[PDB]
Amino acid sequence: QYPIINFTTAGATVQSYTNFIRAVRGRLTTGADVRHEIPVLPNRVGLPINQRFILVELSNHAELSVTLALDVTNAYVVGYRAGNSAYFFHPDNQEDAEAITHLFTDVQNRYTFAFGGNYDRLEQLAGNLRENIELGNGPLEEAISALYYYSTGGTQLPTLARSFIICIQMISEAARFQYIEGEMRTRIRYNRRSAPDPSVITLENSWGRLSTAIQESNQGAFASPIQLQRRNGSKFSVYDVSILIPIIALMVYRCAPPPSSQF
């Protein structure tokens, strides 16, 4: 019932990956909510269960497939299916636990991990931080195989955690940030894997804060600046939504849009 977007790593190109990421953004947002030219994801409050998820079917050159489930309210990967087994991250609350019962309903083996799916938890399991995990098309190809072989014991937990870390950044974070989509495009164009630099990491860590700063701003002006990092690690101060229009593609819903006092 939920919409399915397909991507393969086999022969992937900047164009095929761009088409994918545009398609995932098109299914995450409805057009209802755009502030400063920046689309907002649906509000969790009152969102009917039939509109709550999207499915991303990944395939690779090894001829394997897995299907990730993303929550439209936050673009979070909440679990995945590989053939006859599905695996969900530990839910944050009761209502999320009910909602994930609506995914992969005819799968014969359903498991809920005892750990949640946030980067900090997944980095601990992986034994490596984001900044030491290479991304690109090779890493994605390998991550699709790792997720596929988990149920049979082929995949060690640390390699499963690392594989989620790769998927999340190359799908969810790229949908959230044109900047991160363009970092992936670069790696795919040259077929050269590399770990994310501080510009990528600081944007990932700041997504919620930036979403709230933009939605609470006075006509786009932040009451408090947010500090990001450039590629070389130097500080970049954000004072206004303006500088983020080329950078952030989607925000999480944080407040109602005020009745704009119009001059």
Side-chain angles (χ1 to χ4, degrees):
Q1 56 114 323
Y2 296 124
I4 294 155
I5 306 103
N6 297 306
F7 178 68
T8 185
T9 53
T13 56
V14 161
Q15 194 76 62
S16 70
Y17 176 76
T18 294
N19 292 339
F20 170 54
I21 297 298
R22 288 194 179 159
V24 166
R25 294 181 184 129
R27 301 292 184 175
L28 293 168
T29 55
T30 70
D33 188 358
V34 186
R35 310 188 205 168
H36 301 281
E37 298 161 42
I38 300 164
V40 182
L41 289 173
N43 188 359
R44 160 200 193 81
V45 183
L47 181 63
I49 190 64
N50 68 2
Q51 286 163 30
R52 177 65 182 285
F53 304 108
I54 64 169
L55 296 187
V56 168
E57 180 177 308
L58 309 168
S59 303
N60 69 5
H61 173 62
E63 269 307 318
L64 300 171
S65 297
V66 303
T67 301
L68 315 185
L70 273 76
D71 187 328
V72 306
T73 66
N74 54 15
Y76 262 61
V77 178
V78 294
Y80 84 99
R81 182 186 69 85
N84 296 323
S85 294
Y87 294 94
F88 300 92
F89 299 113
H90 185 242
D92 286 340
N93 46 64
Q94 304 267 53
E95 180 249 65
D96 289 354
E98 194 284 332
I100 58 157
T101 80
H102 300 255
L103 286 169
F104 302 135
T105 58
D106 53 50
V107 103
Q108 60 197 219
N109 301 97
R110 298 175 81 77
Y111 310 87
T112 299
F113 298 125
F115 48 97
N118 300 346
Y119 288 134
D120 190 358
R121 184 80 164 103
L122 286 179
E123 289 169 331
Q124 290 170 221
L125 298 169
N128 272 302
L129 301 183
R130 277 171 287 153
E131 62 174 66
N132 297 313
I133 295 162
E134 295 173 301
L135 306 174
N137 200 56
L140 189 61
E141 167 83 39
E142 296 163 7
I144 290 159
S145 286
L147 264 58
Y148 177 92
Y149 288 118
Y150 186 74
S151 69
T152 55
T155 300
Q156 304 339 320
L157 186 53
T159 295
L160 186 73
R162 179 196 187 90
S163 299
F164 284 144
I165 292 171
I166 288 165
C167 291
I168 294 160
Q169 297 177 271
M170 295 193 69
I171 296 163
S172 307
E173 301 290 9
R176 292 172 185 133
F177 298 99
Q178 299 96 332
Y179 184 82
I180 294 180
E181 175 198 359
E183 284 292 304
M184 301 307 100
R185 283 180 193 172
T186 298
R187 284 155 169 86
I188 289 164
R189 181 175 289 116
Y190 304 107
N191 201 25
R192 296 284 177 120
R193 73 184 63 198
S194 62
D197 77 19
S199 56
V200 172
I201 295 292
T202 294
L203 276 175
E204 303 178 340
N205 293 337
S206 302
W207 183 62
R209 285 284 176 81
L210 292 166
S211 291
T212 306
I214 288 164
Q215 289 173 40
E216 297 273 20
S217 69
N218 280 294
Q219 304 162 347
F222 290 2
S224 296
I226 290 175
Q227 314 293 338
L228 298 177
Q229 289 170 34
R230 310 172 179 284
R231 287 205 195 272
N232 73 356
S234 65
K235 160 178 68 111
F236 183 94
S237 296
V238 184
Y239 296 92
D240 198 278
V241 68
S242 73
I243 206 73
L244 295 171
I245 288 170
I247 293 175
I248 188 164
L250 310 169
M251 290 174 298
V252 53
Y253 181 104
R254 296 297 226 223
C255 331
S260 49
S261 280
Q262 293 258 277
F263 185 56

